[PDB]
Each structure stands twice: as C-alpha cells, then as structure tokens.
Amino acid sequence: AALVVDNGSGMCKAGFAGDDAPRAVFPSIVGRPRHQGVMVGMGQKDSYVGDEAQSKRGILTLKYPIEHGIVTNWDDMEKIWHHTFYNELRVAPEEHPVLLTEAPLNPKANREKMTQIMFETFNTPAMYVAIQAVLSLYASGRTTGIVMDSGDGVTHTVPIYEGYALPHAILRLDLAGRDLTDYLMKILTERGYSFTTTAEREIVRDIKEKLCYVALDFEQEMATAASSSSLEKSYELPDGQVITIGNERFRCPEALFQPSFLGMESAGIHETTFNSIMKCDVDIRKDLYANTVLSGGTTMYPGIADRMQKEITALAPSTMKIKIIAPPERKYSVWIGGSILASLSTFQQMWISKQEYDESGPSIVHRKCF
Amino acid sequence: AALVVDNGSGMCKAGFAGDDAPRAVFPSIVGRPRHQGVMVGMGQKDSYVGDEAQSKRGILTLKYPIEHGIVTNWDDMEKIWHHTFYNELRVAPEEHPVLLTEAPLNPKANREKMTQIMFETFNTPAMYVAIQAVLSLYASGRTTGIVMDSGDGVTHTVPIYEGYALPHAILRLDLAGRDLTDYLMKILTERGYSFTTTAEREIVRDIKEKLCYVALDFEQEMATAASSSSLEKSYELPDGQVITIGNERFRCPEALFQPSFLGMESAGIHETTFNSIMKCDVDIRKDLYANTVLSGGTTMYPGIADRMQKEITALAPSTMKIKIIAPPERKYSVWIGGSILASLSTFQQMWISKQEYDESGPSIVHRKCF
Amino acid sequence: AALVVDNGSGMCKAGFAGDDAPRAVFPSIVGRPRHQGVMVGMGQKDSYVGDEAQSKRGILTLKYPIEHGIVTNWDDMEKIWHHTFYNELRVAPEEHPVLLTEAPLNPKANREKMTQIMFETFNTPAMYVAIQAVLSLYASGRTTGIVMDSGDGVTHTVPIYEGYALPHAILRLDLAGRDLTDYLMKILTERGYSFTTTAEREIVRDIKEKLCYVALDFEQEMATAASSSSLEKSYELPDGQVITIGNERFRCPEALFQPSFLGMESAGIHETTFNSIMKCDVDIRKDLYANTVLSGGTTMYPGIADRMQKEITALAPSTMKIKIIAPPERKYSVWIGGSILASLSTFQQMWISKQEYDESGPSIVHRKCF
Ligand SMILES: Nc1ncnc2c1ncn2[C@@H]1O[C@H](COP(=O)(O)OP(=O)(O)O)[C@@H](O)[C@H]1O
Ligand SMILES: Nc1ncnc2c1ncn2[C@@H]1O[C@H](COP(=O)(O)OP(=O)(O)O)[C@@H](O)[C@H]1O
Ligand SMILES: Nc1ncnc2c1ncn2[C@@H]1O[C@H](COP(=O)(O)OP(=O)(O)O)[C@@H](O)[C@H]1O
Ligand SMILES: [Mg+2]
Ligand SMILES: [Mg+2]
Ligand SMILES: [Mg+2]
C-alpha cells in the first residue's frame, strides 16, 4: 500500500493509499525547551514534534520547518518525516511508495532535497511529488476546473481543462493562514490582548479557527459591529482569562480579499482566481467559471464561498455562470486526491524508482514530476 | 551512602539518603555563657550547639549563624556542621557525599563558602547544593507544580513545569517564621507578657507552634474573639506561670498574608504565589493552579491550606481549579525530597567531585548547581 | 503657544512649542503614605507627585500610572497631568493646545481616554496624539530613517521613508528600562545587596543610570571582569553604605540585546531593528541602514551606539553602510520633535478641535491621529 503524505506549511497529513481520510493529522512544528531542566531522572527529550510539542508548548520554542511552502530547516524537516513514518503511521518507509505534495512555482532545490532525503535517509522504493492544486481536483471527481488551494503558507490557483493544466496561468500568492494569524495577533493589541511568544501564536490560531468568518459585505459588517454588540464573541484562554472580540472576527479573513491590510501590493484571492482564468484561452473560461473549487484549511471560514461567488461575479461577465464548489471536507482535499491518484493503475508507472534516482540523481524529479 | 543536610535558618535536619525521615533534627543555634562560672572541676564548654544549648539556654546567649537563609557567622556554622557529622550522625564526612540545600536568589558567596568548607574543612569526597523548593517537589512525587517553601528565614516560590523550572518567575520574601516569632513577642506585650532575651524568644516560638492558627476570615475571627472567650487558650511557662492569649493566636500567622503588620511593603504569601504563577507562560498556569505545594515548618499552622485556597481562588479565574497540596509531613518535605534525589542513579554524575573543586576553586558550584 | 507633553512610562517631559528643551522634567510617579501620621498641625498631603514623591519616597509607596506605555491607573494619571499644567508649567490648559505622545500598537482605549480627559477634565481647545518614534525623526531634521525609541516601558521601531511610514513594518517590544531596573534589582542579590521596596527600586535605577554601560563584546567583557577588578565601581547609598558592582555594570544593559536573560522569547533590539528594516521594501532598505536613529533614555548607555552598529553590520549585507545616529540630546528627542511639529504652520489644521470632539466623541482620535 502506498503512503500519501500531504506536507503543508502548518499541518502534516499522512495515511495510506485507498483510504478516504488521513490516518495521522498533527501540526508541523518542532519544539525545543527554552529553560533549564531541574528534575533529574524524568524523560526530558531534546526536541518535541507534532502533538507532543503542542501540549508542552508552555516551556517550548515552536519552530515551523516549512515557511511559505518552502522548507527552511531540513534537519527539523527530517524529524517530522521520521515522526510521521515511525510514530504516527508506525510503518517502515522502505516497504511502501510515498506520494509527496508541493506547491507550484516552488524553488527547484526544494523538491530535489525531498528526492534525495526520501531515497537516502528513508530508503524508499518509489516516490512521486505532485502539485497540491492538481490533487484537489482528483478528490472532487473532476477533470475541468480551476482550484484555489489556500493553506498555511501558500495560496495558489491552478486551472485545469480536460485534464490539461495551463502553467502560464498558474498564480501564486505568499498570503495564507499564517499571515492571517500574525495579522490577528497585531489587531488583538487594539483590545489590550498581547500575544507575542510562539506558544501564544498557537492560541491565536485556535481563536482564528473558531471565531473568525468572512463577511459578505465588509463595509456593511463594519457598521453593524460598530452599532451593537451582536457580533461580539467570547473566548477562554488556557489560563482561564476570557477575551472578547468584535469586528476582529471578520477583519482578519478580510486580508485575503484586501491584501493591502498587511501592506502587500498583491491582489486579493478573488482577483487572483479571476486573473488566472483570464490568462487562459477564451474557449475554456466558461467551464472554469462554473468549476471553481476551493481547497485548504484557509478556505474553511464560514461565508468564504458566498463572498467568492459575489466577488467573482462582479468581475466576470453577467452572462457567465459562477459556481463555487466548496466540499465540507476540502481541508483534506489535497490528501484525498493524493490517495485516489496513488491507487490508480495508470499511475504505477509514474513512480520514480530507486534505480532511476541512482542513475540520475536528485534531478530526476524535474523530468518525471510536473 | 550519601548524606542529606537541610540547613534552614532556624532548624537543622540531617540524615542518610534512602531514609524516609531525618535521623538528626535539632535547632540551629550556638549558645555561649554570659555569666561567670564559679564551680571548679565541672565541665563547662566554651559553647553549646543544638539541643544542649536549648536545654541550658537559661545561662546562655543563643545565636543563629544563619539569618534569612544567609550564613552571617561562618565560624559558628562550622560548629553546627561539626556537631551534625560527629555528634548527631556520628559519621566521617570524608567517607560520604554531602547534599546541601539553599534558598534561591542567595548571595553567590554563600554557596562558595559552603563549597570551600565542605572540601577543605571536612574533606567531603563530593558535594552538591540544591534549591529547597525544587527538593520539595521530589517528595510529593510530582514533576509539575509551584512550591511555596516557607521556613524560619526565607519564603520563596519556585514554579516547575514538566521538570523545567522558570527562574524568571522565582519570587523570594524575607518574611518567615522568625519574623512571626518576633511579631508575636511584640504583640504579647499587649497582655503584659515581656519576653526580651534570646532564651525567652525560644519560649515564644514554642507558644507559636502550639497555640497559633490561621483564620479563614480574619475580620470575622477578630469579632468573635472580641465578643467571647472561646478562642482563649492557656500556656504554662517553664517557671510555672500561666499565660492566656486571645486574638494573638491568629494575628501572628496573619502577618504571612498581611506583611504590612510588620511594616513591610511586600505582598502576602497568597499574592506572591499568585504573582509567581502569573509570571509563567499562559499555557502552564492551569497546571500550576492545581498543583500548589506547601513546604516548610511555617506552613504547619492549622487551617493555612484552607486560607491559601480561599485567597488564591479569589485572585485566579473562576474556571481554574485551585488545589493546595499540604501533606502532613511537609515540615520534612525538603529533606525527604533531598533523600530521593540523592539516591537516584541519574544523579550520581551531578556531584561536584574533589578533583573538579581542586582544578576550578569554589567557583565550580555556580556551573554545576542550579 | 502650544504645549508639548511627552508622557513616558517613567518620566513626564513638558514644555512649550518653539522651545529647544523641556521646561519641566519629573518622574512619572504618585506616592502615598504607608505609615500613620503622628504629628498634628503638619501639612501632610494625601499623595505626592513627581519630584516631591521622589524626595519623600522613604515613607511612601511609589506607583507608576503607566505600565508598558499603557495607562493602568487613570485616576493617578489626572494627578500627574494636573501637576504638570498647574504646578510645573504654571499654565491653564484650557488656553493652550496640547500635543501628546503615545507608543505605536497601543490599545485603542488608551488614546480614547486621553482625548476624553483632555477635553472634559482640562477643557483643552485643541488636542493631538503623535507617535513617539515619528517625533524623534523631526528632531534629527530627517524625512527618511528608522527610529529605535526605547524608554521606560516600550521599545519600538518605526521606519519612515520620504515622510511615509510603513505601519506593517512597525515592531514593538515590551522590554525597556524598567525591565532592566528589575533585572539589575535581581542580579544585585548575587553580591548580597538586597533591594525590595518601591523606594529602593528608585535607588537601583539611579545606580543603573550612573554605572551601567554596554559592552562591545559581552563574552570578552565577561573574561575581563573575571580576571581583574578594573571594571569594578563604587556607589554610595543614601544611608552612607558603599556598594561595589563588577560585571553587573554591563550585564544589565545586555538584556536589551539578549532578552533571554529575563526569560523573554523576543529578539534583541539589534535584531528587532533589522527585522523592521527587512519588512520594508527592498528599494528603501539602503536608506534606512544609513539613517538609523536612536531615541529615549534607554539608549543613553555609553557604547550602545557602537554595539548597535556592530550587531546590525553582522546582520546587514557587507555592502551596506550602517550608520547609527545617536545625538547627545536623544533623551529629549521625542519632546524636541514634538516641539518642532507643534510649531509648523502646516500642522495647525490637524489639531482635533473641541467642535470635532463634541460631534464625534472620543473616537475622533482614531480618524485624525496616526
Ligand atoms: N476551521 C478553520 N477556520 C479557519 N482557518 C482554518 C480552519 N482550519 C484550519 N485553518 C487554517 O488552515 C491552515 C492550514 O490548513 P491546511 O491547508 O489544512 O494545512 P497546510 O496548510 O499545513 O497544508 C492553518 O494555518 C489554519 O490556520
Ligand atoms: N507546628 C508548627 N506551627 C507553626 N510553626 C512551626 C511549626 N513547626 C515549626 N514551625 C516554624 O518553622 C520554622 C522552621 O521550620 P522548618 O522549615 O522545618 O526548618 P528550617 O526553616 O530551619 O529549615 C521554625 O522557626 C518554627 O517557628
Ligand atoms: N544616562 C542613562 N543611562 C541609562 N539609562 C537611563 C539614563 N537616563 C535615563 N535612563 C532610563 O530611561 C528611562 C526613561 O527614559 P525616557 O525615554 O527619557 O523617559 P520615558 O521612558 O518615561 O519617556 C528610565 O527608566 C531610565 O532608567
Ligand atoms: Mg495544504
Ligand atoms: Mg527549610
Ligand atoms: Mg520616551
């Protein structure tokens, strides 16, 4: 059975090919103590990975080895891979092919290191690297459509028509969930709440995943929030302190549609999707309008699908049918599509075998993987 | 076998590692005659140490070589150590490693002279200095919790989470049992009882340990004592005179929670414990609330745990469970925890050996001891 | 004539616009007696503000109404502002516009209450809030540069290019002079010096301002202080006691560059300044490197400019010219810049008039003040 590992910037999703849900979902963090241990004979490890780092984050410095879809710490990256195979899946990597995921327009040296590490450190028989947006189309059971995959590090759009991708129309933004979390930390200081440590960043991320939503009309929602307390929500901190947030619930997700909130000059996610469609041929734009698929955890905000449909309709011609496909399990669409692709009989010859890597080096990934 | 010596400001506890109770427990006093001996041929010593000084205190001037956890008379301190090893334990200090205890935030010269005396005067093969609050956590079988150790000279709080101590959150108060004894002497004059000599201070300390208690509500308790004689208690002096005390039973321990009674500007023990928790990271405050451990002889007043739980509950958020752990043997928690640590197999490489002291001087203690 | 009041966490600097130096500089403290008055017929006030509290601190409990650039006790704030206008400047605030200063990324309710108090308690005709780091650039006669303002409560960096600020690149640290005062307060216990009261904290602050300095190489300075007594200095306490400090002279300011000394996870001021520059556009980083401006009393340590240049040079590319601008009067740069700004003819139209506050409430400050 093949292994499907969807390694995003924030979360690592792993499982077996043919399954409908990942078997192991844990944060993609590496935590190291920042204090001095004083109790002798207790099981103090040098570093903590994944869930154990999240539970002990009070005395740890949490680090993300993947930043904006690019691995910045390969030594920490190997720890997460080691934790995935041996502690989460509890399998031997040398007996199963592994399917990896990567964002488009990534540096070439990034995927070459995955090729070298996966073959020389884990000694796997086969490995394939696939584009995350392409895999999301597999999970939706479609061959035509434009997929907006927005995770923790990268927001990218890849339009596919009749199984053919348009590389020139692929757009990538460095605006994602982690930037929204940092923006939420910045705007929470307006109410006197100070979150500065890496552990406190995880707390704010939990607040964002529970109380944030996308407003259908941002300006109208601002007036409603400034006239009454109907939109106010309360959140309990781990130490028992209760915080209350008002317009910050929809201001943080608004940075997706108005990147100028973060000082970025790039266009919003709605315009990026629209611009990607217009970069394609005119004869295929109609099918892309009605097959807009959302993927990634950053697309799980309530009301994001309705807001995208309203915004894209204002940009697209009035005669066009705008249909936003937002499956309830779109957070795992990349993994689910990877499981489908790995189980296909026509995919078994697309694997990069050990014999190919031995006679071609890490550069083989550029010839066999799109 | 290792030796564990807990040198408090007022009381000295000694024993062997692996034992559950100290073998030698005696006051940490040195007494010298203040009169002229007129009997020839009967054995007047120049000084008396420990119990002999306590029994002969009528004709002696009792001196404490340790004040506020800091040794102020090193010549007198050597007498107590010499009495401990040769008269109480009846062992050779050059054949056993010695584990000593010290309060946090002490002067660095205090533990350097402790190192020099152990290696040059007693020729101990090995030596180590441990924090008293850290040892108290060993006795309770915990790796997470905040320990409020209050003895005769020092009241300090050391929060520990998952075996890691937070040095920036360590708070120290110079208010302890000796200050309460002096305060009781001052307020006993309100009833006409005059205690001024050093010997009479020991009598008042015995009164404090037998009749004093902590009131759950000080204001209500004061009203009850002012309306009836139910709280009045009688104590017999060594000469046969009988004294009776009323509200002084709970006013003396009240100085722990209201240091302004002594003219001190610091906060009470409940606020010091709460402030130490609040100095820690938010993710670990919940565990410290439910694992508050009391240590030292000062926390032996009846009802002190209920008062501490009540005070911290009013300060902490209502959603946190306040649990004060006050074991019945907490007067020896520091020693018992020292006995456990000294017997650990993983502790045998933490000793400061004779060779290390010879090649580094007394300054080695700052590198190997926390 | 407009009034310029620079309400920092530790000091209050006030004066008239158009002047080159503040007319009144006094500590921002409010002291209240903690003992009982026994002499009748003496003019004992309920509270003391500023220099009077500093001179009578022996029998007072000193309280700072500002903590980390945020007013925590508004009732004590009106006492200081009343003392500033009527006792120090000896002017009626209802006849002069008042220019106030605030740190960036402050709670929005902080500057709303300042607007409300000025208009309703002091009835100022005009009122304005300016960012402290922006004002420091006015004093240096520059329109481009990054200002590292470090006072008693807040350390923040604000990059400005051609008169345009980059709000997304503004970084703020809660590490400042008061934290260094507490750190020196803690590490002075290593030599046996015990300071606990609020009055004793002012003594420790005076020691820091007179004997502390920034070492060019901290590790090399550690070796020098451990091999000789050339770095030792003597300071006489108010009661005549003489204290001597060695490596504590440069260890206390080192916490600015190594915040881990206080258990804080944030980066040093040298890295914070570099990070703010890196958050800016690439085309403006070269100008910011050569126009780094220091401001505030916490940047008055001898050798801090050389250390900052050395650290930033190690971080910046070798082809960039690092120039740290540290004018000898940088302790009053915020006020001097406010004096320049309030005297500009083009600034007279951005005052928040009384008619604007009346028709818009305290929320007007969020629209007219950056
Ligand atoms: N219910 C939710 N609401 C808002 N944001 C979410 C939600 N669930 C997850 N996220 C965000 O999605 C990001 C990661 O999503 P995902 O794409 O599933 O993983 P990765 O990006 O690591 O591949 C996280 O940073 C998180 O902030
Ligand atoms: N039962 C008791 N009630 C109140 N106080 C006590 C009691 N027992 C001891 N103490 C006080 O505790 C102080 C010393 O306690 P302990 O911590 O055991 O020794 P040390 O502080 O010398 O290490 C003594 O000064 C004594 O006044
Ligand atoms: N010469 C000096 N050396 C070191 N620190 C100083 C010096 N002068 C002032 N400070 C520190 O600067 C802090 C206040 O500086 P300043 O910015 O002028 O006032 P505020 O921060 O209140 O606006 C004080 O806490 C003091 O410790
Ligand atoms: Mg993803
Ligand atoms: Mg003790
Ligand atoms: Mg200032």
Curated annotation (Swiss-Prot), chains A, B, C:
Look up what happens after changing residue 178 to W: In DDS1; likely pathogenic; results in reduced actin polymerization rate and increased depolymerization; results in higher ATP hydrolysis compared to the wild type; does not affect thermal stability; modifies cell response to latrunculin A
What disease does the record describe for this protein?
Dystonia-deafness syndrome 1: An autosomal dominant form of dystonia with juvenile onset, associated with congenital or childhood-onset sensorineural deafness. Dystonia is defined by the presence of sustained involuntary muscle contraction, often leading to abnormal postures. Some DDS1 patients have dysmorphic features, skeletal anomalies, and/or mild developmental delay with impaired intellectual development. Baraitser-Winter syndrome 1: A rare developmental disorder characterized by the combination of congenital ptosis, high-arched eyebrows, hypertelorism, ocular colobomata, and a brain malformation consisting of anterior-predominant lissencephaly. Other typical features include postnatal short stature and microcephaly, intellectual disability, seizures, and hearing loss.
Residue list for modification Methionine (R)-sulfoxide: 39, 42
| Family, similarity comment | Belongs to the actin family.
Q: Where is this cross-link: (Microbial infection) Isoglutamyl lysine isopeptide (Glu-Lys) (interchain with K-50)?
A: 265
Q: What is this protein called?
A: Actin, cytoplasmic 1
The species this protein belongs to is Homo sapiens (Human)
On whether Ubl conjugation is a keyword of this UniProt record, the answer is yes
- Entry's SMART domains? ACTIN
What does the record give as the reaction this protein catalyses? Answer: ATP + H2O = ADP + phosphate + H(+)
Q: Name one GO biological process term.
A: regulation of G1/S transition of mitotic cell cycle
Gene Ontology CC, one term:
protein-containing complex
* Quaternary structure and partners: Polymerization of globular actin (G-actin) leads to a structural filament (F-actin) in the form of a two-stranded helix. Each actin can bind to 4 others. Identified in a IGF2BP1-dependent mRNP granule complex containing untranslated mRNAs. Component of the BAF complex, which includes at least actin (ACTB), ARID1A, ARID1B/BAF250, SMARCA2, SMARCA4/BRG1, ACTL6A/BAF53, ACTL6B/BAF53B, SMARCE1/BAF57 SMARCC1/BAF155, SMARCC2/BAF170, SMARCB1/SNF5/INI1, and one or more of SMARCD1/BAF60A, SMARCD2/BAF60B, or SMARCD3/BAF60C. In muscle cells, the BAF complex also contains DPF3.
Q: What Gene3D superfamilies does its record include?
A: 3.30.420.40, Actin, Chain A, domain 4
Q: At which residues is Tele-methylhistidine found?
A: 68
Question: Impact of changing residue 308 to R on the protein?
Answer: In THC8; uncertain significance
Q: Which residues carry this modification: N6-methyllysine?
A: 79
Q: Where is this cross-link: (Microbial infection) Isoglutamyl lysine isopeptide (Lys-Glu) (interchain with E-270)?
A: 45
The protein's job, in short, is: Actin is a highly conserved protein that polymerizes to produce filaments that form cross-linked networks in the cytoplasm of cells. Actin exists in both monomeric (G-actin) and polymeric (F-actin) forms, both forms playing key functions, such as cell motility and contraction. In addition to their role in the cytoplasmic cytoskeleton, G- and F-actin also localize in the nucleus, and regulate gene transcription and motility and repair of damaged DNA.
- Keywords of this protein's UniProt record, alphabetized? Acetylation, ATP-binding, Cytoplasm, Cytoskeleton, Deafness, Disease variant, Dystonia, Hydrolase, Intellectual disability, Isopeptide bond, Methylation, Nucleotide-binding, Nucleus, Oxidation, Ubl conjugation
Q: Where in the cell is it found?
A: Cytoplasm, Cytoskeleton; Nucleus
